[PDB]
Amino acid sequence: TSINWPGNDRLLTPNMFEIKRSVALDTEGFTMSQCDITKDWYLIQMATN
Amino acid sequence: LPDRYKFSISGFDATSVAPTTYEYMNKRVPLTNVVDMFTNVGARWSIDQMDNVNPFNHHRNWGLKYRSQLLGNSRYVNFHIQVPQKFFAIKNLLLLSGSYTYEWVLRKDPNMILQSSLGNDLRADGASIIYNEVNLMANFMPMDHNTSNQLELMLRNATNDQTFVDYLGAKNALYSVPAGSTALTINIPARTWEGMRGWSFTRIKAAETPQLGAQYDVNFKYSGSIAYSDGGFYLSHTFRNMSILFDTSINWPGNDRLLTPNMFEIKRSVALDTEGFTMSQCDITKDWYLIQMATNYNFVYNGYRFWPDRQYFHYDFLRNFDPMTRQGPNFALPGLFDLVSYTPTT
Amino acid sequence: YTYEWVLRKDPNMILQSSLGNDLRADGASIIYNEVNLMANFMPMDHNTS
Amino acid sequence: QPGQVLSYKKFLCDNYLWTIPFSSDFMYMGELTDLGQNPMYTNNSHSMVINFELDPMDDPTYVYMLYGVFDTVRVNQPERNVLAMAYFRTPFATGNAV
Amino acid sequence: INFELDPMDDPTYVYMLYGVFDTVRVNQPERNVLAMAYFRTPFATGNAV
Amino acid sequence: QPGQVLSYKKFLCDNYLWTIPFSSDFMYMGELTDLGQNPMYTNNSHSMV
Amino acid sequence: TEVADALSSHANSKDARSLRYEPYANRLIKLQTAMVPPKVDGTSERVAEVVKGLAEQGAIYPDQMGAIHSDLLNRVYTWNSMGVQESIQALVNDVIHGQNKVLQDELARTREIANASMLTRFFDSLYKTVDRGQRNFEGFKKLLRLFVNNVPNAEVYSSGGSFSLQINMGGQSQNINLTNAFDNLKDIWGARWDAVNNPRIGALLTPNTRALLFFVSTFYDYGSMEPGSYLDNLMRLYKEAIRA
Amino acid sequence: LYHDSGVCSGTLNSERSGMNVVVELPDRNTELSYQYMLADMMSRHHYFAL
Amino acid sequence: LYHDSGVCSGTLNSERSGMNVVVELPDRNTELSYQYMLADMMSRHHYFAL
Amino acid sequence: MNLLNAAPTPYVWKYNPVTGKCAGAQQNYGATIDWVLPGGNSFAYAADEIRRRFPEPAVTRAITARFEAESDQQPYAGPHETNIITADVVRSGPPPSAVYPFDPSGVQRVQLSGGPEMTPDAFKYYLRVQGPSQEVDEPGVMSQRQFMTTFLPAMVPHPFDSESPDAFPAYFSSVYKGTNAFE
Amino acid sequence: AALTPDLTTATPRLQYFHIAGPGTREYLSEDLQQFISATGSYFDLKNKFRQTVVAPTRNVTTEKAQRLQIRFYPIQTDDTSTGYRVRYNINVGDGWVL
Amino acid sequence: ATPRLQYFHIAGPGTREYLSEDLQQFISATGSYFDLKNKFRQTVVAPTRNVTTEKAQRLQIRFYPIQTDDTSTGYRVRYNINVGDGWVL
Amino acid sequence: LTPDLTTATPRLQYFHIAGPGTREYLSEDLQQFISATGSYFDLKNKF
Amino acid sequence: RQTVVAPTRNVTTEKAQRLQIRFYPIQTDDTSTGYRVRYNINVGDGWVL
């Protein structure tokens, strides 16, 4: 009920699999491939595939 | 008074400016009979026409009155202020040796950073701010390096490392309630509640509440006291009752604890009252009154009493729980014509 | 337990004036409709109670 | 006439934010309450529904519902300029939009 | 599992696919005797005795 | 105009009697201070201005 | 009765001046209760012991303990006679026999449960509350309990009411008594470690008591005792003496 | 300060450990927590201009 | 409440032992006793409406 | 075959990580073979043989301990971690080789900007290495791995038949009757 | 010998965050607590280590259905001109304390 | 610890260890109605050793941003807090 | 009717006007009870 | 059927190790023709980059 599966500070966002974020609202980056997909989500998808 | 109890001044026209501008508030005289010297002439009675009006948006707000006069008597202020860090993880963190980088971003929204005593749109009123220099001050104890390395080494030890909690200790959820609506349902997904502390709730006007986690709220055109950010709560009334059901049908009290075991009846109308269930010479219920005194003061089964040890808290129950009572003529009778009109001709 | 008590109806006893005038001669009166007794019971465990 | 009057019992309570403790006797007995460690909720999943009825206002409002959570940080600094914080919130660990 | 989605304007499902080993072992021990035994590792459907 | 105004930051302090503690860290660590027993001042004459 | 031991003692015995230093009313109350002892009713306590044993033996539930006890008080009082009181005492002796028979069970289990049960009986065999330093007293009791539990070769026994403790270091086994130690440890719970108390109660501690608390302090916390007591700051020294 | 905002939060982290140790959630309330912490810490009628 | 009146006093008692166990003497002051007790426990300027 | 003699599915345990107390046990339905409708006589024996080949709890304990030993994340520092924890304490605080002037002059000392006692590295590491003041774990609560060593999944044939053990879903036995409680 | 517990995988998640831990007096090291006690009048670390008081969670509040509040109507009234009598049958049930 | 200071209890032992033991019992016994505890002075002595560096060290440090990156909505500032060894912040 | 008024118990001690003291006439279980449950349901003022 | 089985030991840490690190520039030197960036890639022990 409370143990996040990665839970080892793997992702740049500690407590979720942030698939995408608003680049206009974005401030610290964390967006990949010239779109709103995140660094973490791009990493997971490319590692999986 | 609220805008619904006001009228234009024969030169002012509505829809020409937003209702959240200064000269809109100035050029709308209130009705003169909704409140006057004869308004409940003998009753200690908060004006029910403004019981839902933010009282901190008043020129008698001594705190804001002091906070505005620290900047000067002009609107051209070369302010120099020192703002504390308030994030709980780093509010009292005791950093040891090393190189740390610590960036933070400061709001430039006049409605956010500045507080008006009228709650008007500051952006629409030409308010603005420019930050020239923002430096970070830190004080270091000149303690002996032979001991501070010892201190930092007994703090690097993992068995004794800093632990910080947010004092509020409350997840914050804002549930919309439209104007005409009188009921709200809060359903939540399945969860374990592994250490839950309880519930706290008031209702805050959406006009006075900014978008949560927003870089810049464009629909926020209010500059008074955001009851969400500070403790300026004023709508703890206007809660008829509430119920809790941990499962689809399992009431949490669920042991005939309360006089109404299936709900937390916060208040009931005394006019419709027949069995009692109203305590402290007002419409708050026996059930709800016990809940508040038990929570804050820890002794209800030994007897209700006043607790002066927590009057300083500014957010407890007894210091600001104000019951009042008036009588009023009974209109809709052969006489008693109710010669006060509350609806302006707009 | 059987617990009975009697309530005052004297206007001068139960009511305090800011002038101290005789309220019996001033038409003051009280009528008791419902006089109920309430109590609080700690739900302490019957094992320990 | 006495039949031509009414009563308007009312109360105001500012800066309070009504609290209900998740304690089995509603009396404060520690921050980690009586039932917060009761292994009928802690062990077993539950999905509560909270129902309100309010005095109808004339303007849109929120209902600022504050749950009771243990949001703590254990700041661990094992070496020089090695800073690591661990966040934990007991009822709502995921911290999503609810 | 917690999801946050862009709100669309019509009811939608979320096609959630877990990762399972839904396998079959096909036994034909004798003539015209066919027998399979289905096994799915994480989300097993099967026979608890 | 904003260029036609000034600022006059000022503070009033009554009944205070500005104090400077003769301590190493300028804090109260005992009525007999840190340096009040340091054997530089106590044992040797110094002439402050 | 301290009056009896004040009359039948030397000229100024410790309890001959304990009455003397009392206020006049308290001293007179002690004198009166010594001269003419007030009688006490055994029942309404013996019945309580019987119902507590019944609940302990599982005969009744503790939820119905008080109701059963009061019903039995009705049944006794409405027939209170010499012949029912002997049945009450028979049931109380019955409770005692059952408790002793239960105790013989844990002295047959693992020794780390036998010594723990004997230690519980030792704790039940002396005072449970002290006027001063109650936190120190219960902290010491818990420390001794977990010391016995976490020392595999600790053996608690009784010899005519004197509950002793045996610690076997292989080549030797030093015996320390607990009854006389806890007797000595009275008026040292509320100690207030400071300049004058340390000489005062450093000569008040027998070698048995110092040995006992030295062995106990091998498992000593900072959350065990009052943070400014003599026992707390003494075990703070003894624990590091054991360590180094 | 942009508290309570997970999209424009602050950032405190070390050099050897480059991961950010200040994570903010949109469901916490930094400002109100300070108000409750300060009011419990001292009476609110005291005026501290700093 | 008719306090300290022996002619119109209350009666709290059990059932099996029906003896009235409240006795009010005309020479005591229950209301002033409550006044002094309540003023000792806390300051009197606090307005407790209940 | 006879299903009364068939090996039962093992009871796997629930850990409840937050409280630390055991959350109970369940019939291990999450890993079960579907063998009666598709399988028949040929696979009933196979499923029984698989079920009775479930490792005994001692073997599972050994496998889990061996799996945990290869973690690299044991609670205490191994040679890798303790070497660097010694390295950083060595290079912490005032340097030992720094020859600084100590001026015990009651008049006219030196400024000594810098950047007469010192602490040894043995005690300096002793401060860093020592554990808490408790040195004993509280009963009831266990970490995940110490819970996995105990509380092992095992086949429990004929569980609800004995004199007075029943099971441990979530309870606290009080009155000599198994009171599955905390409702 | 050094303690290196990884958080966010600590596993109890309450003891490590001291939400239901041992207590500050008994999880800080010997030397650190001595340091805090000695240097505790000018340089404060007491607020930097979390400690939580824990509810008894057992044999203190029954799961049985018990009414927190009971209203007792009069059984005998006997209203007169000078006074108003009320007679009640207060019942403290089995296991109850009033 | 000069004897001149000790004679006046300015740097002396302290009240609890220099008064006659009977007097300490007396003043404590009659401490509820006849207070004598203000007539015997005691001075709290500062640690005066191993608590403060003689090294020239800044008591209050100002940190100014490395990067600012001002925008229309917010005003970011990025600092760099350098805490040397022997410094605790 | 009580078994204590029947005997020769001193009046001041019986009513705790000059008695021993709540720390020493209550049963040693009751002092522990009122101390343990002294934060939420106090009984100390009743003795 | 044939299934490829993962190593599961001595191949990945259970430690809290960030899977993707963003290095802020230490020092910038923005000019009109070029924009410099200086970083500090501190590959901790046991890490491989």
Numbering used by the authors:
A (entry chain K): 692 to 740
B (entry chain A): 445 to 790
C (entry chain B): 544 to 592
D (entry chain A): 840 to 937
E (entry chain K): 889 to 937
F (entry chain C): 840 to 888
G (entry chain N): 16 to 259
H (entry chain A), I (entry chain B): 297 to 346
Question: What does the original paper state about this entry?
Answer:
We obtained high resolution 3D maps for two different FAdV-C4 strains: KR5, and AG234. Model building was carried out for the KR5 map, given that the AG234 map presented a disrupted particle lacking pentons. The structure shows the general characteristics common to all previously solved adenovirus structures: hexons (major capsid protein) and penton base (vertex protein) arranged in a pseudo T = 25 icosahedral particle, with inner cementing proteins IIIa and VIII on the inner capsid surface. In agreement with the LC-MS/MS data, no densities that could be interpreted as genus specific minor coat proteins were present in the map. In addition to these expected results, we found that the FAdV-C4 hexon presents a unique insertion of fourteen amino acids located at the equator of the hexon trimer. The variable loop (VL, diff 3) is quite long in FAdV-C4 (17 vs 6 aa in HAdV-C5) and folds back towards the main body of the monomer, augmenting intramolecular interactions, in sharp contrast to the protruding orientation of the VL in HAdV-C5. The α2 helix in the body domain of HAdV-C5 protein VIII is 22 amino acid long, while its counterpart in FAdV-C4 is shorter (13 residues) and followed by a bend of 115º and another 12-residue α-helix (α2’). Additionally, while in the human and lizard viruses the first helix of the VIII-binding domain is roughly perpendicular to the connecting helix, in FAdV-C4 this helix adopts an oblique orientation, which results in a completely different conformation of the protein in each one of the genera. Interestingly, the N-terminal region of one monomer in hexon 1 (chain B) interlaces with the divergent neck region of VIII, while the N-terminus of one monomer in hexon 2 (chain F) crosses over the head domain of protein VIII, further securing it in a clasp near the AVP cleavage site (ovals, and 7c). Thus, the long N-terminal tail unique to the aviadenovirus hexon in combination with the different fold of protein VIII could play a stabilizing role in the capsid.
